[PDB]
Structures are given as structure tokens and as C-alpha cells.
RNA sequence: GCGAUAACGAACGAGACCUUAACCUACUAAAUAGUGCUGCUAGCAUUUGCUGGUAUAGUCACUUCUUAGAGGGACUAUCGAUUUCAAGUCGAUGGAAGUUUGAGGCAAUAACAGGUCUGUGAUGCCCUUAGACGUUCUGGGCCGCACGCGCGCUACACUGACGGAGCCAGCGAGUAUAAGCCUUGGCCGAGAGGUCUGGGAAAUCUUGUGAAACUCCGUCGUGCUGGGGAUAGAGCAUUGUAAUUGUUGCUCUUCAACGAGGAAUUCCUAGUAAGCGCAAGUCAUCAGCUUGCGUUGAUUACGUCCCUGCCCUUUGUACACACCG
């Protein structure tokens, strides 16, 4: 069936015979940084 | 059109101008406490009644930081705040 | 003699009555007689936008606004009468049209 | 976020 | 699907209308309804026509509500 | 004025194959028919010189045979082609008004039809979802 | 048999949330045996307000 | 001219402008007698200011309203309000002012609104809320 | 008595208004009292209005609300769930057309019926709750006359609503219906069995 | 004294001036009076389909009235209703034009109505003859 | 509430404090009276501290005030 | 704020302030607002009365109502109480208004790993940069459906459905050589829609946006009924190059669950809640959405810390990147 609409006239929609899963939620330190480069206290001397 | 150029009677008096005016200091490599201060007395110079200063960035550090330097009488709410 | 109007219109009123006094004080003096100021009613132009530059928060709105004012002088004078005033009475702030 | 991979 | 009103006047019902209409202390049109058993539909046209022939003093007249009293 | 009668009404009714009930009034009797609705039979009724404060066993066996003629040659009645079921049909391109047991029919031969030349509108007949473009993600829970 | 008050001081809200009033009455007939009784509704001074049974005081609601 | 004074009688938003002139009893609503004022419930409310010191004081008076705006209950509260208010008017300026002070007697200690426009108005929409005072209901 | 001419006619139906000021012209107010004497000072039957429509501002004070007419204080109860909120005028039909059949019953005066309904209906104890957070504690206190009066309103309209629910009989008679019965202490109404109900569990927490 | 029709209850003259103008017959009636809809916003036929186009024009004819000049355009507006949109909101719509530009029509011929400048139908000189004629025949019983 | 601030208290004050005499037990003359005394910017502002000069001297008269 | 006081006197925030709503027969004027007179005219009774139209020359007067500009007006005013007699509060009287007069705008000291580089020719760094991740154009997508949840709209009928008759608001928007605005009035079309004119660059015209609830009169008569309009077919138009995955509407037909909602939980104290409609927005078309406006218009409190949240004080600390320690 190389054209797309041939499979679609006779296939069949079993959709309601498959249970859906019981929970399907899927979308944690924020304050600690994840750069890995501290601030030294000259360069804070030197900016600021 | 008619273009006709004045100079302004008090510089410091003029939040705009001193802006620019910080604006070329900034950039000379100044550090920050010489050049915000360097503006504050001028306005105080002038008259004005309050002058505040607000740098916020980076220097030299990756974390962001906020420096506030303020003098003088300062209003912050209400009507006037659009008039003074 | 001739029917003639003026049209004051700007955003701000103490330019505006300005504008719209001496006018009437050059047609005191002036024997001539005058209907008018007619003080149209004011048209506030407003637009209601979103604070938010992006879709998070709460939900607050700006509502800006303009404050523009009419007002029609009618005039029974000569051309060069009614032309004289507005080049005396100018100010940048109103602009002046004048109909015949 | 995809790597453009031709045919032609 | 309990109602089962009766929309067509037959005979016993005749005259057992204007044999139990002049013994009614108020009537309306579901108190016709709820006694008689008549529908709403007929209750309407069984009173408004027993005000013609002097059964019924019209107390009050609205078209929603048909307030009525005996005339004797 | 109230009447009164014995003998003369009919409980039962049997058009086009399709039951209706006597106790209720004849213009909103007629809708029970499939491919009649309200606003159909009222025409239908006047046309066929019915007054509408009849109940269905309330009429006489001549005036079922003048409703069903009305219904069954709705154009030869000064019924309008927009007040039919199916004008400009997919055949013969000519006006009709479908009744009861002829709507699911070609219906059918709409439905084959349109499955017949495969296009998008009827393969999502097969499917079983809402053709008319209604979304589904999260209302389509029926 | 129902017995009268009527109410002439106000004393302040009690109970968990405050919706009942502590209040003092005084008998309109026998004008004496004056009791403090709860009251739930909004009360100004002279209230006639009924009550079934008398013979029970009424304290702080939890 | 003759014994005529112009007024006008306010409610939310309707406004009555009545004009009560020196002549025979006419009480008109835009050209139309008042037995016949919708709706029929509140045809007693313009009355009130005609069977409260009687229908006798308009014999000498002439009344007609003109009133505009506002919605079905307010524009027969408007009305009400300018035919009291154009009475009481009218026996200042063209009578004495114990019989113009009686009026305000009768009228005031049984509505308050007959003499006195009412102050409320439609409080405005604040956003966040389908109403005044109500808010969008928040779900956590 | 005499009849005034007018060039606009005056009725002679409102012309009875000018001797007495009267419910819709057809009640009086004057062989009206109220047997109950803590709800005297709350029940607001002096003054006589046409109609119960008068459109004042009784909601800016605290004890304004006895000073509102006890047939509009009546009427402003029944405009409720949602569809009929702001529907006063076809609440005061439900009412007017209700007192006409009020009156053919017993023959008796409409709005004694609604006094007789009211004092008693509004619940005299009423058992407060005194429950610590969460669990579940009852104890009775009293109530105030303008409690009374207004919980006998409030519970005496939701009667007459559930009894035209889903029925025939329309709202007027069944408004008209559950002020009679209630006048006369038929337990068979409703805000009858509530009332008892309701001082009864005050009488097992006291 | 002299009755206008202003002094008549809007409702009751109606009843009585459809029904002469019923029984005058010289109004024309369209061919689809008893098939067609009054407002797109209705869903069912006017219930007396033998005199609605007659109770139509006898409050048309009384509106023409008590106003100046006013078109077809503003008469649909007036007669027509909110829609009983399905699950969306109510909506005003505009009634049917053709009607009211027939009921202009029909009672423009009869002189009732004509053309009026600048826009609108005013009444005719016999226009305001038999209204105030039908007030004076409406009041009396 | 109808609580008066400080800004209206201490300028209503200084008032009496300077001039007693010409004041007097009424608020229209004390308002016109504080109108030509002191520089009011807002008419509202000026109504308030004239409405406590006046109640201040209701007090002064009915006894010894504190603070003035 | 009073009051107590090793503190005294101040500043920011709050409040003040500004915008809007309510008062003004007291000023200033208004043919782009109205009225009354006066003409000219029309109807009905003939009483000289009552209702319209017309008068950008009737070469009339006025601003009460309509509009806005200068102002005044309220300051808890007077009086009873309560309280430290103080700050205040509660009841009355007058008042347009005696809840901060109503509603909002603005809104402190530092800050948050709250959200946005998907608004900027705002940017640092990494990637690409000609087979471009730039751009353009074609066809498709964000809509796609076994599922859990949220903001809502219809509704579950009779205070109701329709079908007639009554017929009243307020905020706003608008074009020229364009690439098409609001679009009247007339003429066709059942409708949607189609045709021909005009006005308005704007209190003029669209538009009195003659809106719906609502009022009255009848049909229906508790029935999944004529309460409800889902699913589905056919035909008729408009929008746009292009409507198929139905833009949107209309006509007929199809007559779905829903007969009041478990555990929970939300908003709200006066023109407010709740119903009821209309406008501006995103727009070539599309509003069950927001933002505003107006119609009708309530029940009950005017109290408390019982739940929750936050703030303050005392207290404890081995925390200060500060308990996500």
C-alpha cells in the first residue's frame, strides 16, 4: 500500500481495548550551584 | 525646520546629562567607587536635592550583583514623583 | 464680515484655555461678537496591555491613557481679523486651524 | 537540536 | 413517567369536572391537575371557560398565573 | 369550549413505518418521525390544512393520508428546495426530502461513498472520531 | 412554658470563632436573678430576646 | 411666561427632565398619561408622590417629563423623583413656604429618595475578577 | 372620598390609596400585629408601602436590615440560585399573585399569614459548635429576635422553592401554600420540621 | 377631549387595530408569510400563522408613530433577538429584512406609510387620520 | 477608621500654639482662618488640620490640654 | 495615634498625592446637546385643548437636564454615651456624601538561582555561518488520542421553554489613489448574504449602536417534553492566493449525555455577590477568552484567632552557601 491512505481505509482503531497506565506524570536543589567556578575574594576586591 | 543649539543651565540638576556623562567615565576603566561618587557631589554641587546611583552587572566575577549608592532626600511614592 | 471657525485641539489643558482666552480677550477689545469657546467633550485614549514582556506571574495590566480636548470658536470677521490672532496667540503646544 | 542530514 | 395525564375531555370526565369544580375552595391550573388529573394544557381551557358560564369569579388574571375562586 | 367524543381517538398511530403516540399534539407528533423535526411538521401541518391544537388520534384517517402525501411530495406543495433534506443531490442532482426508513440508507451510500473514494472525511467515519474538526485530546473521553 | 430576657449589657464575643456574644440580661417579669446567657445572633441593648430554659448559666464556648 | 420651573430627577443612570407648568392637572410621561407606566408593578412608585399629600396639589400644575437613559426600574424611580421634586419646586417659587415645607414632610419621612438623588453608582471592574469585588477562582 | 378631576384621569382604584396607604391597594397594614413580643422591635410592619420594591440602602449600618419592610425583607429572599438573583420584580409577582391566593384561602388577611409565618419559623435555640480543630463538638446558645425574623425568612422561601421542584404546581401557590400552613403550625410544612429539628438537638446538647 | 395614540395602552390597541386591519383586507400579504422565520435568533414560526403578519404590521404601523423617519434597517434591529447559540453565548441578531421591507411595502401602498427624505418611511397624511381614528375606536369599551 | 496622622496633629498644634486668640470654637471661620495662616498645598490636607485645630479647642476649653 | 518611657526630635514607606464616581437651578459658554417660545404645518375632540414634523436664518431666549473650566462642598460636623476621658469607637440629627466619601494609579530598605537571551540593531561566552541553524518559497504542524487535571459555557426545567406585543443603557471604533474603515438609506434574498447611492477623518454619520434579561398576552403541562443542542448528512454564502483536518454563518435533517453533582475546595460585605447583554484587543475570516462598560439586584457579618498564611516578640542553635544547612 504505497500511498499513505490505502492502510487507513482498513485498519482498525483498537484504541478502548488497552487499559491506560494508572498514573502518567513526567514533566531539584535549587539554591546550590552547579557552575563549579567559585568567586574568589580578590576578584569581588578587583570588581567591586 | 529651524535647529537652534542651547546650553543647559545646570548640568548637574539634569539627570540626563550626568548619565551620559557617567556614561564616558565608565567606560575609561574607572573603578566603579571613584566614578559613582564622582557624579553624586556634582549633583550635590548643583543643588540637587537628591541624587541616587544604581550599577548592576558584572566586574570582574561571574555572579551578578547590585550596587546602590544613594544621598540626600529622597521621594518615592505618589504624584510628586513624577513633578520633582 | 464673514462665518468663519477655529478649531483648538491639544493634549494639555493649561495650554489649551491659554490658547483659548486671549482669543476670546482679542475679540473684547474688538467689537466683534463671538460664540464660543464650546468645550467639547473629552476623549481619553486608552490601551489596555499586559506588565508581563513574557507569559509569567501574576495577571496585572497596564492601562495608559491621553486626555485630548476640543475646542470651536466661531468667528463673524474679516480674513486678514481672524488670521492676525492665531499668529499673536501661537504656542507650541495647540495647533490652529482655521475654516471658513 | 537535530543534526540536518541530507539525501540528495 | 408517572403523570399520565388525560389531554382529551371524554364524557365521565365532563361531567365530573363541573360536578367537582363548584366544590373546590381555590382552584388553579395544577390544582386541576393534581385532583383531576386533567393536564395543564386542558386544566387552561376547562377554566377558562367555566368563567363564561358563572361557575368561576375571576379573583386575579395573569398569563402565568390564574388565580379563581368559586362564584357562588 | 370543552368537547367531548367516545370511540373516535386513536392511541396508536403507524407512518411510515414509524410509530406515534396519540396523546400528544399532532406537530410535535410528527417530529418523532426520523427526518422530521419541529420546524418541518409545522409546515407540513398547515400545509395540509391541520390546525395545530389537534391531538394525533384526534385526526381522521383522510388527513393521515394528506399528511404522509405532504411528507412524501414535499415540492409538490409549495414546500421550498431549501426547506428539503437533500437538494442537488450526489446522483440525480434533484430535490429531496428524506422520511424515516430512507435516511440511514443513503446515509450509507453517503458514508460508502465518501469510503469509496478514500478521502480524509470518510476514512475518520471508519475511525470512529469527530469529523467536523473537533479537537480530542482531552474532551474525546466518551 | 417559655420565660423572656431582656438584655442590657454587652459584655464581648466568645466561642472558637467569635460568632456568639456574651451578654447580660435581666427578667421582664421579677425583675431580678439576672443571668449571663450566650446569644448567637447580632444584639443591640434591649432585646426581649426569649429564652426555654433559664435555669442554666453560660461560660466561655471552646 | 407663566408659573413654570425646569428640574430633573436622577437614578443610576436614568434622568428625568420635568418641566411643571401653571394650568390644568396633565401628567405626562414623553407625551404618554402616567396610568399606563412600565412596568405595571412599579406604577405605584410614581404615584407615591401624588397620593401621599393628594392629587389635589397638581389641579393647578401641568407636568411633563422627559427622561432618558438608565434602565426600566430607574427610569420610574427617575420620574418619581422629578415629579416630587418638581412639586416641592414649584410651591417655593410660586407659593408659600409653609405648604412648600409640608411637602418635604410628607415625602421625606416616607422615602427618602424623593427629595434626595441618590449617590451610588456602578463600582468599576477590577482586572483579575468578572466583577467588582469577585476574582478569578484560583486552583492550586 | 370625593372624586378629583384630572386632565390626565386618575383611576378610581388608586383613588382609594389617598385615605390609606395599602400592599398593592388591596392589603392593609392596620389589622396587622405580630404575636411574639422579641420580634417586635425587629419586624417592620409601620410603615406602608405599595409595593415591596423600595430600592433603599439598608446594607451600610448594622441594625438597618429591621428597618426594611417585612414583605420586601420576604421577597428579597426568594431570587435565588443563580438564575434568579437580580430578578425582583418577577420575585414580586411570585409574591403579589401569591397573597391573592393567601387570601381566598381561610378568607384570612395575607400579610397576618405572613406574620403568623414567620414567628413560627424562625428558630429559637440553635445549637453552636465548639469542636477543637477538626472534631466534632456541638453546644447551644441562643438567638437573637433579628436572627428570628430572618432565619424564619430565610428558611421559609427554600420550603416553597423544593416544593416546586420538578412539580406542576408553580411557585406563587407553592409559596402561597407553604406560608399558610406554616401560620397555623402545620408539621407537615417545611421550616416547621427544621424548626423543631432544630431546637430539638439544642434540647439534647444543653 | 382629544385621544391620541399615546394615550392608549400599547398592548391592548394593538389587539384590536390587527384585527381591523385584518378585516380592511386591502393590506397585501407575501406568499411566505407561512413558511419563513421572523428572526433568524427564533427557531419556531409565529403560533398564530393566520393573523401574525396583520399583528406584525399593526405594531409596525403604531411604531411608525411614535417616531420620525425610521428605516427597515433599524426595524430589524428592534425585532430582532438573542440567538440561541448552542453552548456559546447569547447573541443579538438582526430579524428577517425582507418581511420588514415587505411590511414597509405593504403598508407604504395602502397609504400608510412612504418614503421619507433623508431616509426612513415617514407617515402619511392618512396615516395619522386612522391611527388616532383606531385610538379613538380602542379606549371607549 | 478615622485615626488623624501626626503631619495633620502637629501642624493643626503649632496652630493654637502661635495662635491662640483669633481661633475660634467653629470650623468655617477656623477654615477660612487656616487658609490665609498657613500654606496648604491640597484642600483636603488644609480640612484636616483645620478639623483638629477646632476639636483642640473644644478640649482647651473643657480643661488644661496636654502639650500645648 | 494616644499612652508608657534613657530617650529627644526627624526622614523613607503608610497616609497624604493623582485619575475616576457622586453634589452644584452658583459662575463660564455651547446650530457637532437640549428645552421653551415663535412661524409653517399635520392628525383627534371641537374648549382656546393634546401629540408629532419642520425653521445651519425664527439673523429667537436659556443652560435646569447634555459637555467641560474655574471653583466651592466633608472636616466624623452637632449631640448622647463608652474609654486612661486621650487617641478613638458606637448610636442618633443635618447633609449629596458620616464604611479610609467610592474605586483605583503610584508605592520603602536590601533581595529571590521566581520568569523571560521566543521583543529589541541588549548583550558576554559556546555552535553554525554558503549543502547556512540567515533568508526565501513550496506541502504538512502546533488541532494530532487508550488517558489524569484546571480556568468556563450551556444545562438539568414551570421563578420555565417557545410565539407574539411593550422597548429602556453605558464604555468605545472609523478612510483618499487607498489596495480599503464604520458603513446608514433604498432595492433583492427565508436567512446568511447580494446590488445602488450618501454621510462621517468625526458629540454631526455609522448609532438613540430601539441589547438581553425583564414586562404583558397565549401555546406547552413534568414526558428526558416543545428543558439541552452534543454526533452526523445534504444544500445555500461570505473571508482570504489558497477553507480538504468541515474558517465562520445560514436552511433542513440528525434529538446524545445531562433529571442538581462524592471526597474536597474557590470568590465575596453595597449598587457588592449573582444573573443579563454590548464595545476594544488579537483580526483578510474566526470570541465559549480577557480588558472595560452599563441593566436588574440581593442573604448574612460588620466579629474572631478555631483552621491556614504572614508579621512581631521571647526562646534554642554546633546554621551564616544560612534546614534545599
Not at chain 2, 29 to 37: F, T
Not at chain 5, 43 to 62: F, N, S
Not at chain 6, 48 to 66: C, F, S
Not at chain 8, 83 to 100: F, M, N, P, R, T
Amino acid at each position: 500500500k504505497s500511498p499513505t491512505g490505502n492502510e487507513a481505509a482498513l485498519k482498525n482503531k483498537n484504541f478502548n481495548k488497552d487499559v491506560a497506565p494508572p498514573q502518567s506524570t513526567a514533566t531539584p536543589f535549587d539554591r546550590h550551584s552547579r557552575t563549579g567556578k567559585t568567586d574568589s575574594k580578590k576578584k569581588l576586591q578587583q570588581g567591586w | 525646520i529651524a535647529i537652534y543649539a542651547e546650553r543647559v543651565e545646570e548640568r548637574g540638576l539634569s539627570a540626563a546629562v550626568q548619565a551620559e556623562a557617567l556614561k564616558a567615565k565608565l567606560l575609561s576603566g574607572l573603578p566603579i567607587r571613584r566614578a559613582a561618587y564622582g557624579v553624586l557631589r556634582f549633583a550635590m554641587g548643583a543643588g540637587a536635592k537628591g541624587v541616587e546611583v544604581v550599577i548592576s552587572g558584572k566586574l570582574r566575577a561571574a555572579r551578578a550583583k547590585s550596587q546602590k549608592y544613594a544621598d540626600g532626600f529622597m521621594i518615592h511614592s505618589g504624584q510628586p514623583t513624577r513633578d520633582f | 464680515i464673514h462665518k468663519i471657525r477655529i478649531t483648538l485641539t491639544s493634549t494639555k489643558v493649561k495650554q489649551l484655555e491659554n490658547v483659548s482666552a486671549n482669543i476670546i480677550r482679542n475679540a473684547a477689545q474688538y467689537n466683534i461678537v463671538k460664540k464660543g469657546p464650546v468645550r467639547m467633550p473629552t476623549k481619553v485614549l486608552k490601551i489596555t496591555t499586559r506588565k508581563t514582556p513574557n507569559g509569567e506571574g501574576s495577571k496585572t495590566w497596564d492601562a495608559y491613557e491621553m486626555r485630548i480636548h476640543k475646542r470651536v470658536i466661531d468667528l463673524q470677521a474679516p480674513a486678514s481679523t481672524v488670521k492676525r490672532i492665531t499668529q499673536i496667540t501661537i504656542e507650541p503646544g495647540v495647533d490652529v486651524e482655521v475654516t471658513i | 537540536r537535530k543534526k540536518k542530514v541530507y539525501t540528495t | 413517567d408517572k403523570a399520565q395525564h388525560i389531554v382529551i375531555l371524554d364524557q365521565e370526565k365532563y361531567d365530573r369536572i363541573l360536578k367537582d369544580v363548584p366544590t373546590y375552595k381555590y382552584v388553579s391550573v395544577s390544582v386541576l391537575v393534581d385532583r383531576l388529573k386533567i393536564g395543564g394544557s386542558l386544566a387552561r381551557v376547562a377554566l377558562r371557560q367555566l368563567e363564561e358560564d358563572g361557575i368561576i369569579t375571576p379573583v386575579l388574571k395573569h398569563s402565568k398565573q390564574a388565580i379563581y375562586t368559586r362564584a357562588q | 369550549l370543552v368537547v367531548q367524543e367516545q370511540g373516535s381517538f386513536q392511541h396508536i398511530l403507524r407512518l411510515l413505518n414509524t410509530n406515534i403516540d396519540g396523546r400528544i399534539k399532532i406537530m410535535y407528533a410528527l417530529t418523532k418521525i426520523r427526518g422530521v423535526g419541529r420546524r418541518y411538521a409545522n409546515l407540513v401541518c398547515k400545509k395540509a390544512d391541520v390546525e395545530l391544537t389537534k391531538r394525533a388520534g384526534e385526526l381522521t384517517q383522510e388527513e393521515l393520508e394528506r399528511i404522509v402525501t405532504i411528507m412524501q411530495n414535499p415540492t409538490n406543495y409549495k414546500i421550498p428546495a431549501w426547506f428539503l433534506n437533500r437538494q442537488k443531490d450526489q446522483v440525480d442532482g434533484k430535490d429531496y426530502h428524506v422520511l424515516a426508513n430512507n435516511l440511514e440508507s443513503k446515509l450509507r451510500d453517503d458514508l460508502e461513498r465518501l469510503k469509496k473514494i478514500r478521502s480524509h472525511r470518510g476514512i475518520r467515519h471508519f475511525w470512529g472520531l469527530k469529523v467536523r474538526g473537533q479537537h480530542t485530546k482531552t474532551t474525546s473521553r466518551g | 412554658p417559655v420565660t423572656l430576657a431582656k438584655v442590657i449589657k454587652v459584655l464581648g464575643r466568645t466561642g472558637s470563632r467569635g460568632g456568639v456574644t456574651q451578654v447580660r440580661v435581666e427578667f421582664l417579669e421579677d425583675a431580678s436573678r439576672t443571668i449571663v446567657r450566650n446569644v448567637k445572633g447580632p444584639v443591640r441593648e434591649n432585646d426581649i430576646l426569649c429564652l426555654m430554659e433559664s435555669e442554666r448559666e453560660a461560660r466561655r464556648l471552646r | 411666561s407663566t408659573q413654570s420651573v425646569q428640574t430633573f430627577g436622577k437614578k443610576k443612570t436614568a434622568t428625568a427632565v420635568a418641566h411643571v407648568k401653571a394650568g390644568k392637572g396633565l401628567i405626562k410621561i414623553n407625551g404618554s398619561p402616567i396610568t399606563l407606566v412600565q412596568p405595571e408593578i412599579l406604577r405605584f412608585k410614581v404615584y407615591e408622590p401624588l397620593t401621599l399629600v393628594g392629587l389635589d396639589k397638581f389641579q393647578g400644575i401641568d407636568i411633563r417629563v422627559k427622561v432618558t437613559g438608565g434602565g426600566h426600574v430607574s427610569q420610574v424611580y427617575a420620574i418619581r423623583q422629578a415629579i416630587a421634586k418638581g412639586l416641592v419646586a414649584y410651591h417655593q417659587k410660586y407659593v408659600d413656604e409653609a405648604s412648600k415645607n409640608e411637602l418635604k414632610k410628607i415625602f421625606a419621612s416616607y422615602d427618602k429618595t424623593l427629595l434626595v438623588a441618590d449617590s451610588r453608582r456602578m463600582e468599576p471592574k477590577k482586572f483579575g475578577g468578572r466583577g467588582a469585588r469577585a476574582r478569578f477562582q484560583k486552583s492550586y | 372620598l370625593q372624586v378629583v378631576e384630572l386632565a390626565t384621569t386618575i383611576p378610581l382604584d388608586v383613588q382609594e390609596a389617598q385615605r390609606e396607604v395599602k400592599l398593592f391597594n388591596k392589603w392593609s397594614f392596620e389589622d396587622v400585629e405580630v404575636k411574639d413580643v422579641s420580634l417586635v422591635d425587629y419586624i417592620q410592619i409601620r410603615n406602608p408601602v405599595f409595593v415591596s420594591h423600595t430600592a433603599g440602602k439598608y446594607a451600610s449600618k448594622r441594625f438597618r436590615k429591621a428597618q426594611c419592610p417585612i414583605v420586601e425583607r420576604l421577597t428579597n429572599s426568594l431570587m435565588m440560585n443563580g438564575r434568579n438573583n437580580g430578578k425582583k420584580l418577577k420575585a414580586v409577582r411570585i409574591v403579589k399573585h401569591a397573597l391573592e391566593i393567601i387570601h381566598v384561602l381561610t378568607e384570612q388577611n395575607p400579610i397576618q399569614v405572613v406574620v403568623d409565618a414567620i414567628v413560627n419559623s424562625g428558630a429559637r435555640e440553635d445549637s453552636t459548635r465548639i469542636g477543637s480543630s477538626g472534631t466534632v463538638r456541638r453546644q447551644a446558645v441562643d438567638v437573637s429576635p433579628l436572627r428570628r425574623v430572618n432565619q424564619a425568612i430565610a428558611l421559609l422561601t427554600i420550603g416553597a422553592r423544593e416544593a416546586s421542584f420538578r412539580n406542576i404546581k408553580t411557585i406563587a401557590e407553592c409559596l402561597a401554600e407553604e406560608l399558610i400552613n406554616a401560620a397555623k403550625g402545620s408539621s407537615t410544612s417545611y421550616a416547621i420540621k427544621k424548626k423543631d429539628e432544630l431546637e430539638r438537638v439544642a434540647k439534647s446538647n444543653r | 377631549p382629544g385621544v391620541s395614540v399615546r394615550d392608549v395602552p400599547a398592548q391592548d390597541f394593538i389587539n384590536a387595530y390587527a384585527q381591523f386591519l385584518q378585516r380592511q383586507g386591502k393590506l397585501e400579504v407575501p406568499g411566505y408569510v407561512d413558511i419563513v422565520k421572523t428572526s433568524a435568533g427564533n427557531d419556531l414560526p409565529p403560533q398564530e400563522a393566520e393573523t401574525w403578519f396583520y399583528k406584525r404590521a399593526a405594531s409596525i404601523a403604531r411604531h411608525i408613530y411614535l417616531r420620525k423617519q425610521v428605516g427597515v434597517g433599524a426595524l430589524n434591529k428592534l425585532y430582532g433577538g438573542a440567538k440561541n447559540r448552542g453552548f456559546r453565548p447569547h447573541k443579538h441578531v438582526d430579524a428577517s429584512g425582507s418581511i420588514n421591507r415587505k411590511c414597509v411595502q405593504a403598508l407604504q401602498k395602502i397609504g400608510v406609510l412612504e418614503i421619507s427624505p433623508k431616509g426612513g418611511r415617514r407617515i402619511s397624511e392618512n396615516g395619522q387620520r386612522d391611527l388616532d381614528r383606531i385610538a379613538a375606536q380602542t379606549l371607549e369599551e | 477608621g478615622r485615626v488623624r496622622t501626626k503631619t495633620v496633629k502637629r501642624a493643626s498644634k503649632v496652630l493654637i500654639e502661635r495662635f491662640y486668640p483669633k481661633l475660634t470654637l467653629d470650623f468655617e471661620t477656623n477654615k477660612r482662618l487656616t487658609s490665609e495662616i498657613a500654606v496648604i498645598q491640597s484642600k483636603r490636607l488644609r480640612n484636616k488640620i483645620a478639623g483638629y485645630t477646632t476639636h483642640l479647642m473644644k478640649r482647651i476649653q473643657k480643661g488644661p490640654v496636654r502639650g500645648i
